[PDB]
């Protein structure tokens, strides 16, 4: 089955910083990759699908890229509402799997 590995597992960052988080697949998933953000106690929300397309109402400071087994979500100038957990998920055949998550926490 294709396994998704996300790095970093945890990232501390300040408001205004630009961060990039990656999602690596153990087999080619042919760009069928989506990103979700999950805030504390809330269900996951779709951010990006088919590698680069933003869902409705996602701010332009988010962008996804990738191909083959390597994908990245870049967030330019982090705003307070962006801290939380980020998950990638593939849709290449079945089973589908999720990466283990990256927790983005505000810097102190």
């Amino acid at each position: 089955d294709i396994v998704l590995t996300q790095s970093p597992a945890s990232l501390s960052a300040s408001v205004g910083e630009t961060v990039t988080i990656t999602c690596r697949a153990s087999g080619n998933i042919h760009n069928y990759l989506a990103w979700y953000q999950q805030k504390q106690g809330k269900s996951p929300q779709l951010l990006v699908y088919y590698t680069t397309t933003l869902a409705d109402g996602v701010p332009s400071r988010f962008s996804g890229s990738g191909s083959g087994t390597q994908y990245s979500l870049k967030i330019n100038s982090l705003q307070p509402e962006d801290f939380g957990s980020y998950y990638c998920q593939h849709f290449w055949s079945t089973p589908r799997t999720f990466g283990g998550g990256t927790k983005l926490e505000i810097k102190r």
Binding site: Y36, S43, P44, Y49, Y50, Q89, F91, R96, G99, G101
Partner: protein, 116 residues
């Protein structure tokens, strides 16, 4: 306005079997797939399986034998049934609508706690 709301039994003893209901509103179950996802406390999301608009199902390889997903198109409900619950099945369980390679609407989840 698409709505998905899950309900489940809450605290259950191990080795019992359970059913969790996802009741959907605002869209037809014949036109979209519904996926089941769970999240252990403080851990990541685990894909459990899905039922396609045509009734076909697919499952997580590891759990396929203990899991069953079915739906009632008329009542707009999708069910996740699990037999022989273990304590590590404790998690928040979510259903989520799928259309064109994304899970675009998610329920709030229901917490299942397997405790003796």
């Amino acid at each position: 306005q698409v709505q998905l709301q899950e309900s489940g039994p809450g605290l259950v003893a191990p080795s019992q079997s359970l059913s969790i209901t996802c009741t959907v509103s605002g869209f037809s179950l014949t036109g979209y797939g519904v996926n089941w996802v769970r999240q252990p406390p403080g851990k990541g999301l685990e894909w459990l399986g899905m039922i396609w608009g045509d009734g076909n199902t697919d499952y997580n390889s590891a759990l396929k034998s203990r899991l069953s997903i079915s739906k009632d198109n008329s009542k707009s409900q999708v069910f996740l049934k699990m037999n022989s619950l273990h304590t590590d099945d404790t998690a928040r369980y979510y259903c989520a609508r799928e259309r064109d390679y994304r899970l675009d609407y998610w329920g709030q989840g229901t917490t299942l706690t397997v405790s003796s």
